[PDB]
């Protein structure tokens, strides 16, 4: 089927002017018949379009600093960065247009290396606003962490909840290189009237173990 | 010198059909090819196709065969695609590249939102805070299509500041949090509101939060 581009890491963490090396293996050669093997290099920063740092290889694109270099061959490539800028923070993508169709790597994201920070976690109950209006929200908020790994549980009176409830997560702070998370419970009026204990319990590297914050309705 | 200029958001229902464009400028528009992308969160980055202005010949992803087409108008030096049945799989980024040659860069990007959903305002609800630092928030809920926006205090206050994404409700609305981390003794004497405005319904409120 297509050719598959596989990269890895899928996350790379540095520290600014660091040395980052990324690399994308090609399921097929991807060399072509004319010499040339197309296997191109983007950088997409958050909320902007893929920009091509290198292409058919090695070729840096006229303007792209000398920092970034391609190497490899046939099927095993890797993006070099000599001294990593916050210019350079986003989403590195591979690509291959030897082959149609031509497809694209899942990516791999550079970011800013931090020490362990554990989060700040705060759960709110619904308003009794929003109670009127016949819904409720539940809200566990988990602030300032690192790394980005957390996993979030919903517990209604020691029921699991699963499936009921959406996460939302902020881009790596500018400053202090940390993320936040927001995590939403939904549930009925009446279900969340016929329960007392909800708890939010967060998992994270960053803690000796699982923190619980709960309230009793 | 080179750009391409896409045409902006589209909010369309299922069975619908859009056309984006994408007006180049500042090479021999006739003389290079011209590639479609798509990028969603289910598929990541795809291929979509190409066309050759030249002579109009073009080269589909067999997964878009059919659905997507590809055309240009040389008049007006614009490349053209069109989406036809659309599903909320089609929900997506799409961007139109040049080629390598002339720099190969992409438009901006395309943003196709499918749904049946009609415009609609949020409710505001409080997160209201209950040792040293509390937390409190906005809780906007239940509006389309994006965006909203929340700024607290008039834009005053926007130290420890977080405004998370939008998620997508299985209703076909929106929902999103806003909060803030602020020092615990502040609270009775500070007054917190965030100011939130949704463009499209014309929805502007402001909320204050307290314990």
């Known amino acids: 089927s297509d050719i598959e581009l596989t990269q890895s890491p899928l996350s790379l963490p540095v520290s600014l002017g660091d040395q980052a090396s990324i690399s994308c293996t090609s399921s097929?050669?991807?060399?072509?018949?004319?010499?040339?093997?197309?296997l191109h290099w983007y950088l997409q920063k958050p909320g902007q379009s893929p920009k091509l740092l290198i292409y058919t290889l090695s070729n840096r694109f006229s303007g792209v600093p000398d920092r970034f270099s391609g190497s490899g061959s046939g099927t095993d490539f890797t993006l070099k960065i000599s001294r990593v800028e916050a210019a350079d923070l986003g989403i590195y993508f591979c690509?291959?247009?030897?082959?149609?169709?031509?497809?694209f790597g899942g990516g791999t994201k550079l970011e800013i290396k931090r020490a362990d920070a554990a989060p700040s976690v705060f759960i709110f109950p619904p308003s009794d606003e929003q109670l009127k209006s016949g819904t409720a929200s539940v809200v566990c908020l988990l602030n300032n962490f690192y790394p980005r790994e957390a996993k979030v549980q919903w517990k209604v009176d020691n029921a699991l909840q699963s499936g009921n409830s959406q996460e939302s997560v902020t881009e790596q702070d500018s400053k202090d290189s940390t993320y936040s998370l927001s995590s939403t419970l939904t549930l009925s009026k009446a279900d969340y009237e016929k329960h007392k204990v909800y708890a939010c319990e967060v998992t994270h590297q960053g803690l000796s173990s699982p923190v619980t914050k709960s309230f009793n309705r | 010198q080179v750009k391409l200029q896409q045409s902006g958001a589209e909010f369309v229902k299922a069975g619908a059909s859009v056309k984006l464009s994408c007006k180049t400028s500042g090479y021999t528009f006739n003389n290079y090819w011209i590639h479609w992308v798509k990028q969603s969160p289910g598929q990541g980055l795809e291929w979509i196709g190409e066309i050759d202005p030249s002579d109009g010949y073009s080269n589909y992803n067999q997964k878009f065969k059919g659905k997507a087409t590809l055309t240009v108008d040389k008049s007006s030096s614009t490349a053209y695609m069109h989406l036809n049945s659309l599903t909320s799989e089609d929900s997506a980024v799409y961007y139109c590249?040049?080629?390598?040659?002339?720099?190969?860069?992409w438009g901006q990007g395309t943003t196709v939102t499918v749904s049946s959903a009609s415009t609609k305002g949020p409710s505001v609800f409080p997160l209201a805070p209950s040792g040293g630092t509390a937390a409190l928030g906005c809780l906007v809920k239940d509006y389309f299509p994006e965006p909203v926006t929340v700024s607290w205090n008039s834009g005053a206050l926007t130290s420890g500041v977080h405004t998370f994404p939008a998620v997508l409700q299985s209703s076909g609305l929106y929902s999103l949090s806003s909060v803030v981390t602020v020092p615990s003794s502040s609270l009775g004497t500070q007054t917190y509101i965030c100011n939130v405005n949704h463009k499209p319904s014309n929805t502007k409120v402001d909320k204050k939060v307290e314990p």
């Open positions: 097929q050669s991807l060399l072509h018949s004319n010499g040339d093997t197309y």
């Open positions: 590249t040049s080629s390598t040659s002339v720099g190969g860069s």
């Open positions: 690509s291959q247009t030897t082959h149609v169709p031509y497809t």
